[PDB]
C-alpha cells in the first residue's frame, strides 16, 4: 500500500506540532477520497475529485455564456449529468453530521439559484460514510432512488492505525492537541 507506507514514513519522520497537524489533516483527505472512488467505482459512475461549478455548467450546456450568470466559483466533489437532471455531489467520511450540514447549505444557497437561473434541473446529494460502522446516509432524494443500493466494501482501519500513531507521538504536545 504505497499510500500507508508514505503516511508511515512521514509520521516515523515528525517532529513538530505544526508538521503533524499537516499529516492529521491529510490523512482524513485520503480517507475521503479513499470512499469518493469506492463509491463511485459501486455505482458504476465517473469519479471526480473538486469539479469548478462553472466546468459542470459547459459539460451540461456547453452553449452556455458564463459571462451572463454569477456563478459561485465553488468546487463540489463530482457530479451527475443523467440528460434531464444534474446532482451535484460531495462525498463525507465522519462519525458526525455537521460536516453535511455546512456543506449541504453552501451549496443549495449558492448553486441552486444560479442553477434555475441558467434552466437546469439540480440536486444536492451529500453521502457520508460512518468510518467505524461503514454505515452509508445520504442527502438527495434522486440520488436514493438511482441508487437504491450502495454495495461498497469499505476498510478504513488503516486510516485509523495511522492517525492514532500520529496523536499518540504527541500525546504530550499541548502545541499539537489545540491544533487538533
Ligand atoms: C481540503 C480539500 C477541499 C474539499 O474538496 C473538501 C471536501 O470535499 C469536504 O470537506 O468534503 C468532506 C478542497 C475544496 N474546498 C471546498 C474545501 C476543502
Ligand atoms: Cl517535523
Ligand atoms: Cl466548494
Ligand atoms: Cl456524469
Ligand atoms: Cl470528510
Ligand atoms: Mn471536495
Ligand atoms: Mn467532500
Request: with cysteine; aromatic share 10%; net charge negative.
Amino acid at each position: 500500500d504505497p499510500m500507508y507506507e508514505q503516511f508511515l514514513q512521514r509520521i516515523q519522520a515528525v517532529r513538530t506540532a505544526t508538521v503533524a497537524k499537516d499529516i492529521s489533516a491529510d490523512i482524513l483527505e485520503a480517507r475521503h477520497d479513499y470512499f469518493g472512488r469506492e463509491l463511485c467505482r459501486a455505482l458504476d459512475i465517473e469519479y471526480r475529485n473538486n469539479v469548478l461549478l462553472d466546468e459542470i455548467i459547459l459539460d451540461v450546456y456547453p452553449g452556455v455564456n458564463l459571462m451572463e450568470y454569477n456563478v459561485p466559483h465553488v468546487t463540489p466533489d463530482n457530479y451527475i449529468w443523467t440528460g434531464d437532471m444534474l446532482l451535484i455531489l460531495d462525498y463525507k467520511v465522519s462519525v458526525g453530521h455537521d460536516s453535511t450540514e455546512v456543506t449541504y447549505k453552501k451549496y443549495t444557497t449558492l448553486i441552486l439559484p444560479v442553477m434555475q437561473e441558467i434552466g437546469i434541473n439540480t440536486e444536492i446529494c451529500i453521502i457520508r460514510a460512518n468510518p467505524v460502522t461503514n454505515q452509508i446516509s445520504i442527502v438527495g432524494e434522486q440520488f436514493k432512488r438511482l441508487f437504491p443500493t450502495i454495495p461498497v466494501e469499505l476498510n478504513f482501519a488503516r486510516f485509523f492505525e495511522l492517525r492514532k500513531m500520529l496523536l499518540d507521538k504527541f500525546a504530550d504536545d499541548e502545541e499539537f492537541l489545540m491544533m487538533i
